Design a protein around this ligand. Sequence first.
Ligand SMILES: [Mg+2]
Ligand SMILES: [Mg+2]
Ligand SMILES: [Mg+2]
Ligand SMILES: [Mg+2]
Ligand SMILES: [Mg+2]
Ligand SMILES: [Mg+2]
Ligand SMILES: [Mg+2]
Ligand SMILES: [Mg+2]
Ligand SMILES: [Mg+2]
Ligand SMILES: [Mg+2]
Ligand SMILES: [Mg+2]
Ligand SMILES: [Mg+2]
Ligand SMILES: [Mg+2]
Ligand SMILES: [Mg+2]
Ligand SMILES: [Mg+2]
Ligand SMILES: [Mg+2]
Ligand SMILES: [Mg+2]
Ligand SMILES: [Mg+2]
Ligand SMILES: [Mg+2]
Ligand SMILES: [Zn+2]
Lengths: 53, 69, 112, 145, 143, 101, 158, 67, 141
Amino acid sequence: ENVWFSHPRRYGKGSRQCRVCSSHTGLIRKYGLNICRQCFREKANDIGFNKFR
Amino acid sequence: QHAVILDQEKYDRILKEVPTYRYVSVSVLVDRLKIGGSLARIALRHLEKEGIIKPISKHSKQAIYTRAT
Amino acid sequence: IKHTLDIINVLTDQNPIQVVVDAITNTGPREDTTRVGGGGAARRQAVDVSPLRRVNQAIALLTIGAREAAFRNIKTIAETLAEELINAAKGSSTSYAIKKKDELERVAKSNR
Amino acid sequence: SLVVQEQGSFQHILRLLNTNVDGNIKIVYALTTIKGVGRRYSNLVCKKADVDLHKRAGELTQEELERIVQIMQNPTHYKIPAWFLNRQNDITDGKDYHTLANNVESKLRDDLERLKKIRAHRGIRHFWGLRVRGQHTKTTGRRRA
Amino acid sequence: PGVSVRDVAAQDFINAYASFLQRQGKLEVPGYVDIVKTSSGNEMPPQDAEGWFYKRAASVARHIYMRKQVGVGKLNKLYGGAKSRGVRPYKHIDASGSINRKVLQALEKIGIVEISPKGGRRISENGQRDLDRIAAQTLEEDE
Amino acid sequence: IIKIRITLTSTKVKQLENVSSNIVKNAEQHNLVKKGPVRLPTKVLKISTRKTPNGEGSKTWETYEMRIHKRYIDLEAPVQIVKRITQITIEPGVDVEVVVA
Amino acid sequence: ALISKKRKLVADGVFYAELNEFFTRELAEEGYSGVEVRVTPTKTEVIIRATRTQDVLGENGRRINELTLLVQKRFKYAPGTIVLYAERVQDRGLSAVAQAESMKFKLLNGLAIRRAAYGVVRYVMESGAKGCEVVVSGKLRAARAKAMKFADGFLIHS
Amino acid sequence: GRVRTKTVKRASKALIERYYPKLTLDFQTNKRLCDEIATIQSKRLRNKIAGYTTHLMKRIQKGPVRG
Amino acid sequence: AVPSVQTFGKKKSATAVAHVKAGKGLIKVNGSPITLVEPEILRFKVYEPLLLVGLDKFSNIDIRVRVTGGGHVSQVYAIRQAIAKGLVAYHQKYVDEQSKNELKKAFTSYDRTLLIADSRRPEPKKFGGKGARSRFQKSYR
RNA sequence: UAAUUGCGAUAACGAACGAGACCUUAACCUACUAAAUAGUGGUGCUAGCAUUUGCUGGUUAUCCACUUCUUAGAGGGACUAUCGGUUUCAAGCCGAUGGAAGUUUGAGGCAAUAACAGGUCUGUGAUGCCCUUAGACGUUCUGGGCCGCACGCGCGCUACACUGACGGAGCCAGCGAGUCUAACCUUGGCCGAGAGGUCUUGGUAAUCUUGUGAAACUCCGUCGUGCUGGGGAUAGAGCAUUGUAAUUAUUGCUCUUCAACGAGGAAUUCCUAGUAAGCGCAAGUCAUCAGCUUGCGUUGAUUACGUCCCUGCCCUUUGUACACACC
Ligand SMILES: [Mg+2]
Ligand SMILES: [Mg+2]
Ligand SMILES: [Mg+2]
Ligand SMILES: [Mg+2]
Ligand SMILES: [Mg+2]
Ligand SMILES: [Mg+2]
Ligand SMILES: [Mg+2]
Ligand SMILES: [Mg+2]
Ligand SMILES: [Mg+2]
Ligand SMILES: [Mg+2]
Ligand SMILES: [Mg+2]
Ligand SMILES: [Mg+2]
Ligand SMILES: [Mg+2]
Ligand SMILES: [Mg+2]
Ligand SMILES: [Mg+2]
Ligand SMILES: [Mg+2]
Ligand SMILES: [Mg+2]
Ligand SMILES: [Mg+2]
Ligand SMILES: [Mg+2]
Ligand SMILES: [Zn+2]
């Protein structure tokens, strides 16, 4: 309800963060992952992404 | 710089050097006689309209003509 | 190529494939020159040419001559290739192909 | 069939609106060689003035040439659209103009001077001679000469 | 013994149908036919000014015959080309929707194409009939 | 007697396969017409990203793939038989959805 | 719902990863090994395989039902559409995550690196695997870091 | 090139050692034999086993070998 | 009735499905005559089969080809196969083995393999280069 | 041998990792299972022309039949098969035939030991220690900056033209992505030169966007060796879209301005077949912005089938005053 404490973040970076580390750089938004690429590399084997070729 | 209109001296020339050689083309006309290309093409159209040259093939990029017989 | 062989037929009544064969035969470079280490001036020694390399260098010379003689001209690629093929069929010291052949032969007979 | 049998009335380079207009090239591209006017506006001018498109500029003589020049000066009266001109919704009048051979340079310098006198950043950049559109001069713009 | 626009060549048939539409003349062209570039991907207007719109009409009529139903978006995608963006690489940019729809509704007001359900425009009865008869005269143009 | 559609999908090919074998088996001992399963094109979820956590090293890329396999079968069955199929045939990972129309 | 099957399956994968991270964070003491989402419409089943499942249903199911409430309100399901189950993990010795948890416990207690790692590797080899290795690595004795590799048995790599 | 490895060589030598009367001179029959009397888990590897086995059969018919 | 056979012809991405039946003897692609396909100089490439064997053996056959995928050269080289394999399949199924065989001898004597397709397939592209084998230009300085 | 890959030799024997094997993908299957969310043929109804049977089409509740093409799942297929040479005549190699495939079939994925005092505390609620911790180096708001330009380098994109530019017509892909408590991909109709706008529609997706009707190309025409209709930088004016906000122009469009560049010096990069190169398209970042990257398909050459000369690499022997190791 407080004024003077927010600026419009409804588009672009800042409005979107990584859902594991609240980071704004290097997001993956394909298929609605909303995770950074490094975390994605860590949790891909548990999500279900397996490299084949 | 070339001649792009016919002053009737190029006209009666090309009428009198149509038998002189065999292979008629745009570049042949340009090199034998100083015509700036477009009139050479128009002259090819006029000569195939009344053919004392006959066509071998008529592609756009190049037209190949020789003498009537 | 179809336009070129048509121009070949218009210029001369003989077979255009025979013209191509005669051109390749008359511009195959009989004697090339290879490289030798040769401490100092890093020498070159004359060496004969296998027939496939003859044919390949012949076709390459013909097409490079047509390219450079019809880069910026009124004359088209078909006309330039046809006149080069005619002069290579009758070697008249006018084809770029036979000029490169002749310089290859003279540098080979000098460097042997 | 379009061979022309005229002998004497063809002419070499000619004059139209303070410019040396070439006489043995096509009429639309000779109008293009006139400054302040390009290929598309030239082609439109010739077609709307019913001037023969097919050939060069030796004939297509006087009376059609003044038809050409008057539809160049007053385009808006002869169903030439307002967006086809180079300077529309102007500085201080709002009526649509087409600038020609000298007026194009004179009026580009004039509105550059207008923005210099209003002391715009655009004026400051045009004064220093740098790239006034948003461009990176760190790596390009070398050798201005 | 059996005639179709598939059985006649494309360029020839298109020239002859353009000449037929020239000889008839009932096309009610828009006033800006000399203005346009036929696409934003062009830079020069069409050269043959007296018959470019009628050639477009012939091509569109043949297209409607060849297909089931298409619209102005399909026509703009077909008649578009490569846009020269200067030093940047070329891209495919669609054609002029205004002249595409003008020639479509002109063919409608002749009676060659009509509105087809689930959206679209499809070939008409007399349109298929007169395209087939001019396909005939182009087949028996031989001396 | 209602004509419904059952659509299954998963990422693991073998458990999807024996789910489908169970389904076609049960439909075949209780035949309706025959309705062998129809196999859709496999959807390859392709995600390509850099190997490096930082921006140093040789520029090597990697492509993770998810594979989505999806089948449908049509059944024209009464109420309780539609039910008993839909609660008896169930395995981990395979998501099965039933639609009346 | 009305979600494409593509995004629904990848969201199920993200759901599984979040359960794994959750249960590793709170369920560390009793040796969490692996969760499996036995998805069934109308009450999905979530099986937790852990070592001390007495120490998940410790006092009359207390912490198991507060974890149930936690996962419930975290993932916004209707109450009663998810229930956790517990399993002893058969072949508890041949579990790499359980071995890592046990070695973490020993190093937090203060056992020597060599002693704890030899205990872990010998325990795996006597439990009945075909190969085992432990790559504890870091500042063990001095400031500079060092890698000690304890490999006993038979290990493929490709 | 086409050099065969220790897996196929050792396996084929064991097969020709203890299954000489049953095994034939033809690749197709010999690979059906290998499929039935060996619980090999790879199709290409099985084909390699049978091919080298056929090669050894032809060499045995030609003359005595030391291996 | 309708003694027809279905054959196919592939190049890199073009599939040409040829319906080959006993009829009056017409040969058509996409509902249009072969004399009207538009690769311009490859009109003879299509005719190659019809020509080689001889028009006679087609004076009783109606073939209709439906074509999908791949650019124009892929389109034409596929017709060639279909109007040759559909031919070979029809002479297999309905007429004498010596006739089918001598057609095979002519086809493999002149062949650009024709009856068999090309195993050349576009290999995948690798990172670090805009091409499949070529890599980005490095600098060292 | 691509390979400490094998044949063999033998104070070594028996093993292990790696390589290979393996997995994915691209090729073949008119053999199996199938399929209005992929097709095909016939049947009805219907449209043209020819009419003499026919040819080209359209048709969702017109059905019937099938799976060749399309998708998959289960399998099969190639193992260098057969033959001829060559080799202590062994491992193998070469040529030909057959074959969809005979450079470990092609391409990848994974990929050992030991290290680097390689990069990264700016991915991490991974972190020890130090610093700061309330007029904070926390966080937030307003406005700038990361773009600033005498210059020097590195990836690239346009080009320096007729094997071309333009103008018409012809006309063909594949990988993929897409909206729920949101507002995505948009068909179709209409307005507009154009960008774009508006009214609807379909699609949570083999169904709809989308046959992504892509571009290079093909044909017919204009131009014409002229820095020219090549080239489109630098400029001025206007019209739109996204966004709270575009001014150091976000981009898009229109008109006008029309510069260097005439094939590039020393040097230097990549590449052996559907590869190079040309050509576009999709996705990623994304409210808007591709000249970038990651994939995809279209068109598709030349020249080797070698050598250790340059640059390096592996093994053995040898020399060493080197061991932070020839910097
Ligand atoms: Mg076009
Ligand atoms: Mg280009
Ligand atoms: Mg490429
Ligand atoms: Mg029907
Ligand atoms: Mg042999
Ligand atoms: Mg491999
Ligand atoms: Mg870090
Ligand atoms: Mg700020
Ligand atoms: Mg920066
Ligand atoms: Mg780089
Ligand atoms: Mg063009
Ligand atoms: Mg497609
Ligand atoms: Mg230009
Ligand atoms: Mg993008
Ligand atoms: Mg930006
Ligand atoms: Mg970038
Ligand atoms: Mg010494
Ligand atoms: Mg020392
Ligand atoms: Mg020194
Ligand atoms: Zn993250």
